Amino acid sequence: AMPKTLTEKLNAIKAAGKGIFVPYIMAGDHEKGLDGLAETIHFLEDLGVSAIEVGIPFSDPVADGPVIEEAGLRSLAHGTSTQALVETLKTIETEIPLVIMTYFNPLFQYGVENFVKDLADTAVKGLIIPDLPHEHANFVEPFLANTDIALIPLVSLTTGIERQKELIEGAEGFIYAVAISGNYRADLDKHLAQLHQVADIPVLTGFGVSSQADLERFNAVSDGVIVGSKIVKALHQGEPIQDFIRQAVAYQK
Amino acid sequence: SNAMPKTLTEKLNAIKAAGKGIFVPYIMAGDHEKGLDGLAETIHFLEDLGVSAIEVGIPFSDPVADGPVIEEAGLRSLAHGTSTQALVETLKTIETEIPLVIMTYFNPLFQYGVENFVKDLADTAVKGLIIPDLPHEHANFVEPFLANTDIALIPLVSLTTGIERQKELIEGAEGFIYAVASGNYRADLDKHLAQLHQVADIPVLTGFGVSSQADLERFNAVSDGVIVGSKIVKALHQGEPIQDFIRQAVAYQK
């Protein structure tokens, strides 16, 4: 198509028998932060550089909190890789359905289609991708079409009900309710119950369950609970957690 | 509908229908004395307690491979409140005849929205894009959005992994080619650089550590030019002299 101006400009320098010189700078690494970027660029322009590489600093998307953040670091230090996890999961036989929770990047690096196909014969029945926006569900949903893997949607309890209906339309597996300042104190119990009524599949409460009291409260207004930090921490530190789980599983009505 | 209903929905509905609460523990895969080899043990432990399902976390691994100087520069930048959104806005402000090449890992791009990012830079000095951790097989996530634009997607080509293998990357290259890798008898790099140089239809630049004029001249003998990263970032930060080095480098004639 239309030739790109960067190719043209570099070809011209080469054609003139001059060496191409491209400095790299980190955007925002300046006394004035991003307000220093123009100054740096013009400084390099004045010296007649061919082009300038402008780096964007990398921030991770992990928002799970310290207990789980540390568990991830321990896991990586044991040499855990996505590929090795998939292979290990093929090994494991269980009647319990497994739900994979991952951020998008590891999935993307592995290959979404590959990941789904490689788990076809496993105990994996669900997939949660916390940083995948609803508008970009097409990155995963097509590959789950013929499979036994449900894409679980994360639904914010504080958003309007029409928005929640949109998120959960065509949802499979279950609905993961999340609740994240403001002079307005939201009644979480009310919102949870409202979501519960509206949904055609099970609604689980996925925040703030650390005690039997928490567990009973949320079971009154939903189908159940997801418990993360407490279990991860207990397993790591060797605290007994059997009693808590036994009691939780035995919740009736 | 016409498709088979998912087993997870059925299993959870059955627990609910029995009037029992659903209970789902989360575990981090690999967080065990035995690492991944402990996963089965943990799952069976939870199965024995009659949990409804198990959430199995995948650890997130950092993609940054830039080295200490640039790693530190990133942390400084973040501590100044730098965001992708603010960078884009700042770039709309900047007028320059020099073409700018954005280097980013995929995740920040993904978070921003690839299409948004490209459209938001449409009228700016950005003419190139480098995404070190974008696998060639998944170039469809970016390439389509660059189709009608003036932004070239620059490929990283490894000199060690053999040029013919990376034929697809090189043939479908725009902007320039970023090559990555008398003494030490690893003169395989010189040979590979020269081979890549002949085969390429656009300029080939060296992205090995250039820290001296000697480094610069060596690579210019077998390529069209160099990219200089750590040396410049460190010098700007530490107030080391850099103007002379750049002046000399820009002026170099073979």
Residue numbers in the entry:
A (entry chain A): 0 to 179, 186 to 258
B (entry chain B): -2 to 178, 186 to 258
Task: Give the original sentences from the paper that presented this experimental model.
Tryptophan synthase is a key enzyme in l-tryptophan biosynthesis in plants, fungi and bacteria. The enzyme is composed of two catalytic units, TrpA (α subunit) and TrpB (β subunit), that associate into a functional heterotetrameric αββα hydrolyase complex (TrpAB). The enzyme catalyzes two reactions: the α subunit converts 1-C-(indol-3-yl)glycerol 3-phosphate (IGP) to indole and d-glyceraldehyde 3-phosphate, while the β subunit condenses indole with l-serine to give l-tryptophan, with pyridoxal 5′-phosphate (PLP) functioning as a cofactor. The Streptococcus pneumoniae subunit α (SpTrpA) studied in the present work is a 258-residue protein which in its monomeric form assumes the canonical (β/α)8 TIM-barrel fold with three additional helices.
We have determined the crystal structure of S. pneumoniae TrpA, the α subunit of tryptophan synthase, a key enzyme in tryptophan biosynthesis, and have discovered that it exists in solution and in the crystal as a very unusual dimer formed by swapping the N-terminal H0–S1–H1–S2 portion of the TIM-barrel core. The dimeric fraction of the monomer–dimer mixture was crystallized in the monoclinic space group P21 with ten chains of SpTrpA in the asymmetric unit. The structure of SpTrpA was solved by single-wavelength anomalous X-ray diffraction (SAD) phasing and refined to 2.54 Å resolution. Moreover, many of the previous examples with accidental TIM-barrel involvement in oligomerization are not bona fide 3D domain-swapping cases because the monomeric form does not exist. In the domain-swapping of SpTrpA, the N-terminal structural elements (N)–H0–S1–H1–S2 (with the sequence Mse1–Asp59) are contributed by the complementary subunit. The linker or hinge region comprises the mostly hydrophobic Ile55–Gly64 decapeptide. The hinge-loop region involved in the domain swapping is the only part that adopts a different conformation in the monomeric and domain-swapped forms. Thus, the open interface seems to be stabilized mostly by hydrophobic interactions. The only visible change is in the conformation of the short linker (Ile55–Asp64) connecting the swapped domains. The active site in each TIM barrel is restored and two α chains now contribute residues to each active site in the dimer. Since there is no corresponding ligand in the active-site pocket in our structure, we cannot confirm the exact role of the disordered flexible loop L6 (residues ∼180–190) in ligand binding.
